[PDB]
């Protein structure tokens, strides 16, 4: 019999462009067939009534019910290409910086200020004009102030008086913009938030991409932080300038991914003072607009599955060549 690869995500994800790229590439593998879980039956129905897979491929997103993915994966016990459980953690910035200083990954330095909803004035918080104290731990502007919640994307950086003082305040992408400058100076009052050092770039964040420990693509966008105007082409999409990673950084994304037992993962790097810095990992992520990661993808996933269960199900399989990049 074939194997089965499952896909189990919300609709948006898995009818996307990419996904639907990639999906159609994998079904190119002679023993391989794709079986696309509708949402309805993601969110409706038990899990004992989803679809049969030998190897799933299943991600988190808006109003994913990962608790049942989890209890699908136990059921069942396929083969997991992006952990399941991993997948709580990455929605918390904590947990994801935590994983990053514990595999000897650089980031920003940083404080966690944990503030209780109910006392919020209690908190270990000092601030002055020009810094913040978080913990006893010293931030001068710049600095950033990222929720707690990685799904929540209002990140604010604070200026320096000698730059004018005020805030940046950035968000998910409203059509041509964003962030957008504020007067205000102070930090927030409510909520709880992880503070780091701003690190200076050229303006731009590199974006990278894994399909596995050894294969990462790299691009870069213009950093939102700057002024919060989106660059766009002649076509209308957002402007992306080519990177190559270095050795360390391929070393970087082959950690990034095992450490979160992501095998499609994406991560951001900040390149400052002759190093690189992750300063957020996001979890499943596909490149859009390149044919090249498409085929790259799709063959590295299927061999990946090939490799793993070729044997179970008494399939050839001789472990070919595959690119880093
Ligand atoms: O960024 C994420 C989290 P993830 O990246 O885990 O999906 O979700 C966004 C929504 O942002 P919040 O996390 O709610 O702050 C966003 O809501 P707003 O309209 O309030 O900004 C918004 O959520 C709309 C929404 C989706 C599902 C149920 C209810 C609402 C957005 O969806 P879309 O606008 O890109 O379609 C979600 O991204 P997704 O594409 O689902 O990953
Ligand atoms: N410590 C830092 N120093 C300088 N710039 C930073 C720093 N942290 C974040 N940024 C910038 O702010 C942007 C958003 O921060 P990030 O941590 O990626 O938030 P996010 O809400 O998780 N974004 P997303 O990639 O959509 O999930 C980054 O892409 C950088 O341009
Ligand atoms: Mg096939
Ligand atoms: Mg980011
Ligand atoms: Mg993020």
New binding site residues.
């Given amino acids: 019999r074939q194997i089965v690869v499952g896909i189990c995500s919300m609709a948006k994800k898995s009818k996307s462009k990419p996904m639907k790229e990639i999906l159609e590439r994998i079904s190119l593998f002679k023993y391989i067939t794709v079986v696309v879980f509708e949402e309805e039956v993601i969110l409706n129905e038990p899990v004992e009534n989803w679809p049969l897979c030998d190897c799933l491929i299943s991600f988190h997103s808006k109003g994913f019910p990962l608790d049942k993915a989890v209890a699908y994966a136990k059921l069942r016990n396929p083969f997991v290409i992006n952990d399941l459980n991993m997948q709580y953690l990455i929605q918390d910035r904590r947990e994801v910086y935590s994983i990053l200083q514990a595999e000897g990954i650089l980031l ?1 330095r940083y404080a966690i200020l944990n503030r209780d909803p109910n006392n919020p004035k209690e908190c270990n918080l000092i601030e002055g004009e020009d810094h913040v104290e978080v913990n006893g731990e010293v931030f001068q502007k710049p600095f ?1 102030e ?1 929720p707690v919640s ?1 799904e ?2 209002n ?1 604010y ?1 604070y200026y320096p008086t000698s730059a004018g003082g005020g805030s940046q305040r ?1 968000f ?1 992408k409203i059509g041509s913009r964003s962030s957008v400058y504020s007067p205000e100076s102070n930090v927030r009052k409510t909520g709880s938030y992880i503070y ?4 200076p ?1 050229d303006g731009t ?1 590199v974006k990278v991409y894994t399909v596995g420990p050894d294969y990462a693509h790299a691009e870069a966008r213009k ?3 700057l002024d919060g105007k989106v660059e766009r082409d002649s076509e209308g999409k957002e402007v992306r300038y080519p990177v190559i990673l270095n050795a360390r950084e391929k070393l970087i994304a082959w950690k990034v991914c095992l450490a979160f037992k992501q095998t499609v993962c994406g991560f ?1 790097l ?1 390149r400052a003072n002759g190093q690189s ?1 992750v ?2 990992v ?1 979890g499943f992520s596909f490149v859009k607009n390149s044919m090249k990661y498409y085929d790259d993808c799709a063959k590295i996933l299927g061999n990946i599955v090939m490799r793993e269960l070729a044997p179970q199900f008494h399939i050839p399989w001789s472990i070919p060549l595959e690119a880093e990049d």
């Fill in positions: 920003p950033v990222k990685a929540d994307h990140v950086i950035l998910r780091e050092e701003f690190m770039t964040d950093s939102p932080a951001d900040l810095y300063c957020d996001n």
